[PDB]
Amino acid sequence: DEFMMLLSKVEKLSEEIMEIMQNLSSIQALEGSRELENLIGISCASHFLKREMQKTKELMTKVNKQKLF
Amino acid sequence: SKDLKNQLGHLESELSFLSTLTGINIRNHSKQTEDLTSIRKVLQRHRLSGNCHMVTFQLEFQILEIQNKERLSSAVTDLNIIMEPTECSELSEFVSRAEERKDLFMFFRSLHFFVEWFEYRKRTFKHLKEKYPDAVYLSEGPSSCSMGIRSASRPGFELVIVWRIQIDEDGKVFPKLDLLTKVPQRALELDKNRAIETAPLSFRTLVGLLGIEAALESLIKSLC
Amino acid sequence: EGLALLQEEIDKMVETTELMTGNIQSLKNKIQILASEVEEEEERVKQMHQINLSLPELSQKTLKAPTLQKEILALIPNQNALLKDLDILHNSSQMKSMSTFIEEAYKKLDAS
Amino acid sequence: KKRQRMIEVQDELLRLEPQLKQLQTKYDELKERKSSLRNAAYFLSNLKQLYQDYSDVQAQEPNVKETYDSSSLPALLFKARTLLGAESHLRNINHQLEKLLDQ
Amino acid sequence: NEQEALEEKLENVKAILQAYHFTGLSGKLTSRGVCVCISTAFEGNLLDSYFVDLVIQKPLRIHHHSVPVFIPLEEIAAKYLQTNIQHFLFSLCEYLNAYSGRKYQADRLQSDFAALLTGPLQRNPLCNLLSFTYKLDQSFPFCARLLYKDLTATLPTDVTVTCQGVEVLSTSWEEQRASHETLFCTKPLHQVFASFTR
């Protein structure tokens, strides 16, 4: 259950990680060229992700409350 | 009714048998018929949902069953496939091209081939991580797109080999396993043969002489 | 007369029967010669890698594909402007928590 | 007399042309293999040496800034996908929870 | 009623079993083994099926096979029959679909666009090579040779476009000869004959 003190840090990081990604003017100019996204094999947009970080902050509180394993 | 129950024990003895050899089972298949009066053509649309290994997925399509005793032929008019958002854009072009070619036998043709390769990705990254668990780190689990080769001793220098299976323009399966190099410039300061640059061109011919299993355990034995 | 027609093929055969004696058997003879040395150096590197799952073969075409390392470089222009502002991404303590998060969670789902 | 040089010269070339290419290609099937073996041996003969030379210099300084050549660039872009595309991973584990959603 | 209950799944299991034939090869259990009906298609247009009986014994023996002896069934049989019986039935699909992928090209070339071609199409009982001569009609003859050698795919591997009577002054041969080879390499036959008479 060592993630419940790492995930609450992620929503502090969500700020700190998106800011330092957007503060780097080269991160935001490589997506939009979606041809660059499919070689890597993952998404690279991140401003819409201000709530996907929340979509996981949502369900990661759902993991350990059950802790089904 | 005695045998009316044995009919289910035998026609389901057929269902699993198909799900085993094909690798393709079938769950929901509704049936819909349409007559057109105006030598007489009749159209059917029916939707189907199955699954292969981990791959779950749904097919909705329509057939233009032309009827004539001189021409008993058949065709399809439009398929529409939707799948789960995976990290490989092949599965976004897997739909993007199958709709312009519209045959589903090729669909289930390459999917057997696709998941069969994907399971090589799993079993090898599980076979290396049981034989060399101190030097291999799977970036995204046993289904990761590649593999790290490093230690907690030399972190700034690793080699990541990338397992990338794809499907061509024809509609057939084409994997492609090449090399990437993670290195500090300090190590180039000493490299005098400079084989570190010609590493992918060498690696694309490294699996040639040896195969995947023998080339990679060679590249891990040369690292450690 | 007809010899003008037959004059062309009396040479057509000599062009090829003198072609077989040198081009066929010599190539045959010098294959067991190469296969001798070809076997040898394999053992010299079998000294450095073990001989031997059933991993299958890749076509000539998978290998003739563009080496994806060179393609990553050519794909994005002003790459050297990227690498400078790319160390500081892995560097900062924020990302060190996310990299382990994704792996530390993947590890247990594959067992259960 | 047009018969003899037909059945004898035409079957000559039709019998010896395929036998030839099987030799041109197999002779080149191993020459291209001989090229490869002196390459793979070269590539291993350097990578083993380089790694443990890097080993002896790694021990010269425990912590140190490590400049990257224009060669290590594609790899950092990979290892950073876990950060860059956290969305998909973070959305994929949400549905991995939905494998266990029925529980 | 023990009848009203078994009625729900029998109508559904007898039709989803008939749905495997829509996906590819289906199966009907028999006394001495199982019947496997490999089904082919070339772009939605269904061609002929092929049933390959087989006995569930060791070593596996094919009872009968309706696939042509023209395709290399025996060569792929040995390589893949006893081992990976599932793979045997899929490499077979790669050859059966490839054949019915080519037969549906040339037979549509003859059935439709035959006025353009001077000498008849030259096929192989395997549709393995297609040689054929034909004119863009002023009078502009051509000749070409489709050379299929990858038995798995439906489009060729080597292409020739040598026309008898090419004039050096008219580069329109060259300009069209080049578009004749290239389009034969990436687009089917019946799909380019409709693109150059539109």
mmCIF file of C-alpha atoms in Angstrom, chain B residues 1 4-5 7-8 10-15 17-22 24-29 46 48 59 61 63 74-76 100-105 108-109 112-113 116 170 172, chain E residues 2-3 6 9-10 13-17 19-29 34 39-46 56 85-87 89-91 93-94 97 150 152-153 155:
data_model
loop_
_atom_site.group_PDB
_atom_site.id
_atom_site.type_symbol
_atom_site.label_atom_id
_atom_site.label_comp_id
_atom_site.label_asym_id
_atom_site.label_seq_id
_atom_site.Cartn_x
_atom_site.Cartn_y
_atom_site.Cartn_z
ATOM 1 C CA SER B 1 -36.129 -35.459 -23.743
ATOM 2 C CA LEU B 4 -32.137 -33.196 -26.900
ATOM 3 C CA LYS B 5 -29.678 -32.705 -24.030
ATOM 4 C CA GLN B 7 -27.320 -32.528 -28.709
ATOM 5 C CA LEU B 8 -26.008 -29.684 -26.549
ATOM 6 C CA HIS B 10 -22.145 -32.618 -28.728
ATOM 7 C CA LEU B 11 -22.668 -29.256 -30.466
ATOM 8 C CA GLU B 12 -20.837 -27.579 -27.603
ATOM 9 C CA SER B 13 -18.174 -30.281 -27.955
ATOM 10 C CA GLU B 14 -17.847 -28.564 -31.357
ATOM 11 C CA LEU B 15 -17.755 -25.020 -29.933
ATOM 12 C CA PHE B 17 -12.990 -27.552 -30.328
ATOM 13 C CA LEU B 18 -13.183 -24.580 -32.693
ATOM 14 C CA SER B 19 -12.099 -22.094 -30.007
ATOM 15 C CA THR B 20 -8.993 -24.246 -29.449
ATOM 16 C CA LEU B 21 -7.662 -24.840 -32.967
ATOM 17 C CA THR B 22 -8.757 -21.517 -34.466
ATOM 18 C CA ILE B 24 -11.063 -17.784 -32.207
ATOM 19 C CA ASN B 25 -14.193 -18.362 -30.164
ATOM 20 C CA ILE B 26 -17.601 -16.768 -30.661
ATOM 21 C CA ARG B 27 -20.193 -15.562 -28.158
ATOM 22 C CA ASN B 28 -22.979 -13.290 -29.513
ATOM 23 C CA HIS B 29 -24.125 -13.599 -33.126
ATOM 24 C CA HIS B 46 -25.312 -9.163 -38.420
ATOM 25 C CA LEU B 48 -20.529 -10.445 -33.817
ATOM 26 C CA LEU B 59 -17.327 -6.793 -35.753
ATOM 27 C CA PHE B 61 -20.766 -5.661 -41.050
ATOM 28 C CA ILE B 63 -23.235 -8.607 -46.896
ATOM 29 C CA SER B 74 -21.561 -12.969 -52.804
ATOM 30 C CA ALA B 75 -19.900 -9.809 -51.511
ATOM 31 C CA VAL B 76 -19.781 -7.437 -48.544
ATOM 32 C CA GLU B 100 -11.178 -0.179 -47.517
ATOM 33 C CA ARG B 101 -10.391 -3.834 -48.278
ATOM 34 C CA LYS B 102 -13.401 -5.241 -46.391
ATOM 35 C CA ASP B 103 -12.601 -8.964 -46.192
ATOM 36 C CA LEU B 104 -12.630 -10.393 -42.665
ATOM 37 C CA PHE B 105 -10.774 -13.643 -43.398
ATOM 38 C CA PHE B 108 -8.713 -13.190 -38.632
ATOM 39 C CA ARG B 109 -5.736 -14.274 -40.777
ATOM 40 C CA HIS B 112 -3.709 -15.256 -35.412
ATOM 41 C CA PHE B 113 -0.328 -14.126 -36.723
ATOM 42 C CA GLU B 116 1.166 -15.313 -32.037
ATOM 43 C CA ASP B 170 -0.865 -5.734 -48.120
ATOM 44 C CA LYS B 172 0.066 -9.310 -43.781
ATOM 45 C CA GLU E 2 -36.344 -29.677 -19.406
ATOM 46 C CA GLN E 3 -37.239 -28.894 -23.031
ATOM 47 C CA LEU E 6 -32.406 -26.421 -23.636
ATOM 48 C CA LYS E 9 -28.876 -22.298 -26.229
ATOM 49 C CA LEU E 10 -29.348 -24.824 -29.053
ATOM 50 C CA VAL E 13 -25.041 -22.614 -30.457
ATOM 51 C CA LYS E 14 -26.056 -24.020 -33.860
ATOM 52 C CA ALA E 15 -25.718 -20.561 -35.477
ATOM 53 C CA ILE E 16 -22.587 -19.283 -33.749
ATOM 54 C CA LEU E 17 -21.003 -22.563 -34.875
ATOM 55 C CA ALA E 19 -20.456 -18.186 -37.644
ATOM 56 C CA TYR E 20 -16.934 -19.674 -37.671
ATOM 57 C CA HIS E 21 -17.452 -20.174 -41.404
ATOM 58 C CA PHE E 22 -17.916 -16.404 -41.665
ATOM 59 C CA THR E 23 -14.616 -15.766 -39.840
ATOM 60 C CA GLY E 24 -12.566 -18.303 -41.789
ATOM 61 C CA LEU E 25 -12.332 -22.058 -41.507
ATOM 62 C CA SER E 26 -15.104 -23.677 -39.468
ATOM 63 C CA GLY E 27 -15.417 -27.216 -38.168
ATOM 64 C CA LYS E 28 -17.779 -30.178 -38.046
ATOM 65 C CA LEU E 29 -16.795 -33.078 -35.794
ATOM 66 C CA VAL E 34 -13.013 -33.411 -37.928
ATOM 67 C CA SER E 39 -12.829 -20.320 -46.804
ATOM 68 C CA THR E 40 -11.320 -17.684 -49.081
ATOM 69 C CA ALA E 41 -12.006 -14.087 -50.046
ATOM 70 C CA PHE E 42 -10.466 -11.305 -52.099
ATOM 71 C CA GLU E 43 -11.696 -7.922 -50.811
ATOM 72 C CA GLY E 44 -15.161 -8.814 -49.583
ATOM 73 C CA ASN E 45 -16.010 -10.764 -52.721
ATOM 74 C CA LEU E 46 -16.230 -14.346 -51.513
ATOM 75 C CA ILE E 56 -7.352 -37.388 -34.926
ATOM 76 C CA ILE E 85 -1.879 -28.252 -36.338
ATOM 77 C CA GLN E 86 -3.438 -24.831 -35.771
ATOM 78 C CA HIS E 87 -0.566 -23.289 -37.734
ATOM 79 C CA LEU E 89 -4.476 -24.645 -41.020
ATOM 80 C CA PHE E 90 -3.356 -20.997 -41.208
ATOM 81 C CA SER E 91 -0.304 -21.188 -43.472
ATOM 82 C CA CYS E 93 -5.035 -20.107 -45.623
ATOM 83 C CA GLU E 94 -2.127 -17.923 -46.754
ATOM 84 C CA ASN E 97 -6.444 -17.096 -50.082
ATOM 85 C CA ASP E 150 5.632 -14.754 -53.236
ATOM 86 C CA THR E 152 1.462 -15.692 -49.840
ATOM 87 C CA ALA E 153 0.537 -12.278 -51.263
ATOM 88 C CA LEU E 155 0.207 -8.840 -55.876
#
